[PDB]
Design a binder for these strands. Structure first.
Lengths: 188, 189
DNA sequence: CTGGTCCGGATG
DNA sequence: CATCCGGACCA
């Protein structure tokens, strides 16, 4: 195993790894919570997050994407929201957010793109949940959701991984080379 | 407003009340699901159900009727909503062969809505819309091969036990009239 | 930022 | 009759 609060890639799980259900992603250690989009500790940082299209105003360019906190009424920079913000190379600011000094100095975040992400993203997988590698918080800030109309906390993530992204020619060749296929639970 | 897990009649909604669409029945609190035939919770009981003639082998005598579980197609199982309705029966739960109530009137109450779509199998269904017919209780339930569909279904016997008279009786008809109960459409429709 | 389930209603 | 367009509810 690895500890629940492990930063960085999970040993033995290559980028391009794909599981049918969230619980499988949880078993593999890649994203512990079965439901929540963010795994983190509010005084340490965030270890991983899931892109599943929950917010219609989010955008995804593959190398970069915006992401939304949780917590309808206004969100606050608390709990998991605070945790992800702490990954950014910048002082914590729960009033106007912050932009990183040197973005690559941020703590790494495992990113999982779900098929449900096709609602807003062209880079999301056709099926299941795909591990897409390590990203870092460039900046975070509060804003009124265009789609929902209450204050949300938004984050800009930028990929910084030695493993090639699954949609690139190189990443596609590697998935094939490692025979990465959609994993169903035993019997299912 | 009553909680979603309320047993018994909805306050202010008399037997004989009729709504054109299922969503209206849902908004009145009488039957929460917009689509499903059974509202319940599988470790509690069932609160309401809708007769809309989806199973051709069901029978209806007004005071009593048989009802069919869902989940079925493959065989049905005594799970989810099926299990919920079974829990209403005054008897130990038995997911192999079912059970019959010791004292049927001690069972948990079930709100029954008869849909006009029920006229496929029943002469007690209304000509139009969805009608609240009052409180029924599960007398017994058992698994059986559907005569009309060929797979195993869970079947239930429901029996009326309500102080409010049934809509099709002389008394119920008088009462619907006296209360000016009419088919209700959504506003504007 | 689950997953399974579902006795509608409209359309044609 | 087949297909779509969905959500609400619960485990």
């Amino acid at each position: 195993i690895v500890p629940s609060n492990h930063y960085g890639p999970i040993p033995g799980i290559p980028v391009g790894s794909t599981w049918r259900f969230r619980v499988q992603v949880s078993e593999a250690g890649v994203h512990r919570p079965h439901v929540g989009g963010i795994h983190g500790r509010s005084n340490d940082g965030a270890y991983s997050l899931v892109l599943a299209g929950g917010f219609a105003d989010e955008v995804d360019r593959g190398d970069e994407f915006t992401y939304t906190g949780s917590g309808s009424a206004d969100q606050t920079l608390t709990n998991m929201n605070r945790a992800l913000a702490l990954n950014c190379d910048a002082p914590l600011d729960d009033k106007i957010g912050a932009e990183s000094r040197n973005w690559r100095a941020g703590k790494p975040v495992r990113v999982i793109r779900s098929f449900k992400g096709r609602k807003i993203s062209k880079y999301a997988p056709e099926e299941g949940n795909r591990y897409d590698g390590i990203y870092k918080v460039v900046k975070y800030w509060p804003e009124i959701s265009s789609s929902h109309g209450f204050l949300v906390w938004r984050y800009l993530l930028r990929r910084d991984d030695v493993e090639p992204a699954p949609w690139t020619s190189e990443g596609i060749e590697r998935s094939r080379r490692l025979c990465l296929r959609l994993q169903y639970p035993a019997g299912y």
